[PDB]
Amino acid sequence: NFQKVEKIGEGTYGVVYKARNKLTGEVVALKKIPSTAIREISLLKELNHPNIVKLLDVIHTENKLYLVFEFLHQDLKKFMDASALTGIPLPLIKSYLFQLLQGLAFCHSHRVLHRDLKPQNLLINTEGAIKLADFGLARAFEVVTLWYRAPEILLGCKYYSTAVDIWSLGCIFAEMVTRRALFPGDSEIDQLFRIFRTLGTPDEVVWPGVTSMPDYKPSFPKWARQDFSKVVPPLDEDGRSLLSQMLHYDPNKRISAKAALAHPFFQDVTKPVPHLRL
Ligand SMILES: CC(C)c1cnn2c(NCc3ccccc3)cc(NC[C@@H]3CCNC[C@H]3O)nc12
């Protein structure tokens, strides 16, 4: 029912093609991937928001799974690699952050988490919109990147909360601003140790219950924190204050997406259009 145009990427969950529906003329992203997955995925069809890549259809046929998504022309990694010499301008960074926080406040209010936010999962159009892609696919179901993984996941917490998406988004914010990934780990311990080196080794004072976590070891080295002004210059004081609340160790103290939308950093938010080369 779909004509493959080109290979657009390769996810955890299978390979993705830009495709054309032969009956409608519609251009879509076709992703080819147990009764349990079916019901979860079908619940995603109703989870609709302008800052979430629209799931158009779930095609369970000939004992196979295809997800048909809205197509967007560009991802945030490629826009960042392409914006490398001058950086993404601040008003655009802020507008993308604000829109992503809208999409997360939406999903989280419906008790749906992403779990794997990353620049390659954040898709942009020519209208200045940014959208979350693959929402809900990790709960429904190449080396997987760890750079955006929240410390409670890395510490083996089995029951992650919406706080894990705020951490990832925090990491992406820092990266848009500095033009470098914040925590580029290449293994779980390297990832954890890069977080500790920047934010301090967490203890019982900043994160109660931490030393009881499954993969916590008393033997972790103990590094002191660094100042956000060393970590993300040239971000201003409001952006630094928001980021630090998005990067709180304790997931219970981490700001929510809805509180983050009220933060003074967003007082002058606007919706710029990007210069996009397609
Ligand atoms: C949510 C999906 C299925 C969708 C809709 N548009 N789009 C684009 N568009 C950006 C793009 C366009 C042309 C060439 C490369 C990338 C890229 C893309 N890449 C797939 C990766 C692997 C699976 N999960 C999402 C992403 O990490 N997935 C999607």
Swiss-Prot record:
Residues 2-266 form the Protein kinase domain. The modification Phosphotyrosine is found at Y13, Y17. One of its GO terms (molecular function) is protein domain specific binding. The modification Phosphothreonine is found at T12. It is found in: Cytoplasm, Cytoskeleton, Microtubule organizing center, Centrosome; Nucleus, Cajal body; Cytoplasm; Endosome. PROSITE patterns: PROTEIN_KINASE_ATP, PROTEIN_KINASE_DOM, PROTEIN_KINASE_ST. Phosphorylated on Thr-12 and Tyr-13 during S and G2 phases before being dephosphorylated by CDC25A. Changing T12A: 2-fold increase in activity. The modification N6-acetyllysine is found at K4. It is an enzyme of class 2 (transferase). Its EC number is 2.7.11.22. CDD domains: STKc_CDK2_3. Its cofactor is Mg(2+). Induction: Induced transiently by TGFB1 at an early phase of TGFB1-mediated apoptosis. Found in a complex with CABLES1, CCNA1 and CCNE1. Interacts with CABLES1. Interacts with UHRF2. Part of a complex consisting of UHRF2, CDK2 and CCNE1. Interacts with the Speedy/Ringo proteins SPDYA and SPDYC. Interaction with SPDYA promotes kinase activation via a conformation change that alleviates obstruction of the substrate-binding cleft by the T-loop. Found in a complex with both SPDYA and CDKN1B/KIP1. Binds to RB1 and CDK7. Serine/threonine-protein kinase involved in the control of the cell cycle; essential for meiosis, but dispensable for mitosis. Phosphorylates CABLES1, CTNNB1, CDK2AP2, ERCC6, NBN, USP37, p53/TP53, NPM1, CDK7, RB1, BRCA2, MYC, NPAT, EZH2. Triggers duplication of centrosomes and DNA. This is Cyclin-dependent kinase 2. It comes from Homo sapiens (Human).
